[PDB]
């Protein structure tokens, strides 16, 4: 047992960035005495189920495949955690719409950074993902990453598709927010009309009062657009991450 | 100094520790309390509770460890001890691991190919339960935020004010007692 | 995953049914005394927090018992969902 | 491996089985009560709580240092809930640690809610008198900390708090 | 848990008592100088803050002794409850 | 001496590589929209991290299999500022000069794009005051108009496509 | 067991030395001046540790030769609160009393210097509401005035001279 | 705790004194230009900041020494209270 | 004794080196510009650490074989403040140096924190004179507070004027 | 701190100097059409803002070179003082 562990760190530093920013294995929700043994169990389960490929490899390659796997395993983490980062987006552009974290939208020092509705959506979508083939899909996505550039390959990955990532994450977030956001703006423009026809009121306070509750009411009568983006995302991460490399 | 150090965590990975040591950590993050039920405290409470759950597994496996004879210190004999020397923790693993995730660590199961499947199954299940616990602490959190923005005051954060209400909701619930009872009755019937 | 949808819509219903009473009283008082800052000219954007604060007090202190019991009878239902499978 | 496998688990047995729980959930909640997020410096409060827990555990430590402890066992059946120690079941040691730990977490949250509360009253008062005055945009965390400290030094503060919190264990 | 209920209702009572006086004086001065922003033209939202600022000093530097004593007589009683079990 | 290896590696990637140029421009676009959370800080510090590691990929692959990295420093450092620290080159007298050159260029290129957002903010505020009403906050109206006009202008795609082409041939 | 020697030594420093008095006061000065990030919190832990180790220096090298540190503890411990943790003196009966007395004293000396900054914050808030506007947060405008009021005081020099003369005659 | 009570009372006194001058000058200049909102057509809720902005500057640029000196000599007094007991 | 040193290596860096002088200033420049998130505080720790270790280079590369370190401390300590801790030994040069550079770094930061709030108040003044009140001038004031900083050669002349006190 | 007296009082000087013109042109042209809010029937606060946005801008487009040569020279003075202690 000397060659057993040189294959073990190469799977560690591919899968340890998969737990960092995957918001049901790290929002500070598992202890740092759990991350290291959970990865040393999952990695030991992967390299005895035969889900690797020989590179016939030593004499310059201890820290050399370190920086390799971080450029690969992060790319596995990023297209795998796209929906949660939409819902953690779609919480924010709902509660910064109604003014929850509008305290820190002026002086970002002593107010709200990680708010109270975005954490609710970020756990709720993690649960809805996690029932519907949660850890199976992630772990076969790890073997799909192993199908392309296992741990000894060159990983000369295609460029211009990880640069459209963040506009994908913005486009889906604004489109998915669109039933909530435009009615809040219709309400606030209508109350601006009311402030024009009565130029003495506090339009800001009266705007906040109705415009928080109306947002939480519109999130309630949705019932439809919560789960069915993840079949799209199943086919998506089978397609995108295949054509990223 | 890793196998000298992380072996009390590798062994305590995939017994029952994960199942508690997320949920308590997910109850602390649910109350708005960012640090105060200290991490080195809650990872101790979860450890002693999980070792209580594992004690009738541990001594009755140590009986099979002790009578033996079980010549050791090689690869094949420890694999033989993992099935024909334990025989009841493996049934404990088969009880709580998914019939669709333990098949992933394969090519009538063994032992070493269920511990990652068991660890991820408990991360899955503990995250389910921790979301159900998080779920009535955001009704109070969003009610306080809504009636606090509705009462003019926007700049003051509800993280300061909600914690008395998120604890008068929680100690009157009986709190860690009814939670730990309802969470340990899954493992001790 | 029916339990998640039912608990999530029940949480988004409890937020609405709790926050409908005091936020509704707050916006009725704010809009109404904004209408008294109309034609009887009393143009000050400093008034209504003197009166909204009592309404959100009175419509909470009258109703803080109910805020307990359903939200406690809610918190036991969830407990059954973790004494189940 | 025994000289590190017994040392790695030992902070968990101090912060899980001793009286450390009862202080480490209170003092770090005193810090978050005042609005101060960092300044009493968690490295420090986990030292105050640890030496004050070692002061309580000292007649247990030197007695058991000489079925081995048996005064720690009798210590556990004094702050454990009676209707919760019957759930984790003569008695033992390790069937008595988790009932004690859960009992002190529940009692420490009750103590913490008692003292988190005479500070949120003055926090909401400063916010109300600072909105009705008009200055809506300024955060009252700057103004509230002097009043939440003059309200706490006039209490005599940490002295009478640790007196009233250690009288349950030494009297 | 009835002690928790009594302490919580006493806290809501102390918030409402300590914010009846200065918020009430502030909104009474605001409404009463809005009465001088009636037919006697004073249509500027500047002079209320010039005078409300002194009121919630005058109703707060004169009265903060009382804000001490009851809020310390509260803080001892809580300490009494944690002298108990 | 591998304790100083992993510890000083965030203090070398965020200080000596191209992570400065992206970690400033991205978080400067986010703060311009008003919405300072919806791309997360953990999100932007992952996009900028892989966008910096892909630029450092041929440099590390050529160097560890340091003269290639020094060519990368000398190409992008201001020569008017690198000569001050040399009072050819050495390595360690360029990393402060390179880091300050990238911070100055980051504020330069970030300010060149921060400007069409404040003019649409002033457009929204001016058309709100021109329609009578003044006593309403136009930040909350302007923020989704600063989103849906930024997403439909292809946004981060047209941004970061020419923010790494300054450092690579794509 | 040199690890249990060493894993408690930060608890002996932050609990039994004079590190409490500076690690509360300095770290509260950062919170006092508005900007709660600026002197790089680990920096203030560095300054407070080197100053507390300077104060402990005639106990540190005079311990490597023990009835010279407890006599330091008796000087700054409360008279009546050390008697509560008693029932001469002993060891493991003063460090709670010493630590609680210096936390109380640190909050007192902290509230003394916290106070001439909330006055100038409320002054700037009052002149900024009186100047028409409402929406601009005065935390921005407060910081340069809260620093011109601090640097012109001589600042950290006169503060640490006022704060360390209690422990050195 | 008479040192603490004296410092707190002097703090409220310094707030009131240091804000009595510029708020008063601001509202006097505002009401003085509001006397031109008589029969003369000057109904604008935008004009007085055109003058009030200089007034708050003039009673502070010409008065920054006083705002210095006592508020600096106050900061020495506190220092005395922590050099002594 | 090999883990008794790395537990105090960052304390000697952030308390005894030139790091203080930069890590107060640049973090204050981030807070000065109104953009108090974007230069990514670990980045500023990186810039300040490499720029401080550049100054420490003739001290470390002559100290690996200390006397020039004590000379470095005696050069950058106030006359009127080293006398107090003196009432030679290493532990009495450290706190006077650390407090001297905290006071000097707050002075240097105050000199530069000041030409930004004047343009902040200019933008607030022209915003209220231009009718609008409910819009905060933070978002509108950021680009002007930064174009005032780019046209000052950015961070170049700032770091030159901040490091020339240490390289004669 | 004697140079801080000179640098600090020059900060309030530039608040007076650099904001005298763009507030002043705003309170002249905004008062010029405010003088067209006299007996001339143009009672709107809608068209006397689009003339004020363009009224400030001509005093902000042409006069912006006065903001350049001396506010950088004010910052070149500051950069010269910090080369000393």
Numbering used by the authors:
A (entry chain F): 10 to 254
B (entry chain A): 11 to 117, 132 to 213
C (entry chain G), E (entry chain H), H (entry chain I), J (entry chain J): 1 to 85
D (entry chain B): 8 to 73, 94 to 116, 132 to 213
F (entry chain E): 9 to 73, 96 to 117, 132 to 214
G (entry chain C): 9 to 73, 96 to 117, 132 to 213
I (entry chain D): 9 to 73, 96 to 117, 133 to 213
The authors write:
Proteins are exported through a genetically defined export gate complex consisting of three proteins. Here we present a re-refinement of the original FliPQR data to higher resolution (3.65 Å) and also the structure of the equivalent SctRST complex from a virulence T3SS (3.5 Å), revealing the high level of structural conservation within this core complex between flagellar and virulence T3SS.
Many of the systems proved fragile, with little to no SctS (FliQ) associated with the purified complexes, but the Shigella flexneri export gate (Spa24, Spa9, and Spa29—here referred to as SctRST) could be purified at sufficient levels to allow structure determination by single-particle cryo-EM. Here we present the structure of an equivalent complex from the Shigella virulence system at 3.5 Å by cryo-electron microscopy. As previously proposed based on the sequence conservation in all three components (33% identity to the S. Typhimurium FliPQR across the operon), the structure conclusively demonstrates the structural conservation at the core of type III secretion systems. Further three-dimensional (3D) classification of this particle set produced a series of lower-resolution maps highlighting the compositional heterogeneity within the SctRST sample, with evidence for SctR5S2T1, SctR5S3T1, and SctR5S4T1 complexes. Furthermore, the order in which the SctS copies were occupied clearly progressed down the helical assembly. This observation is in agreement with the nMS data and supports the hypothesis that the complex is assembled sequentially, with the SctS component being the last to be added. The greater fragility of the virulence complex versus the flagellar complex means that our sample contains a variety of differently assembled complexes that differ in the number of SctS (FliQ) subunits associated with the complex, supporting a model for sequential assembly of the complex coupled with extrusion from the inner membrane.
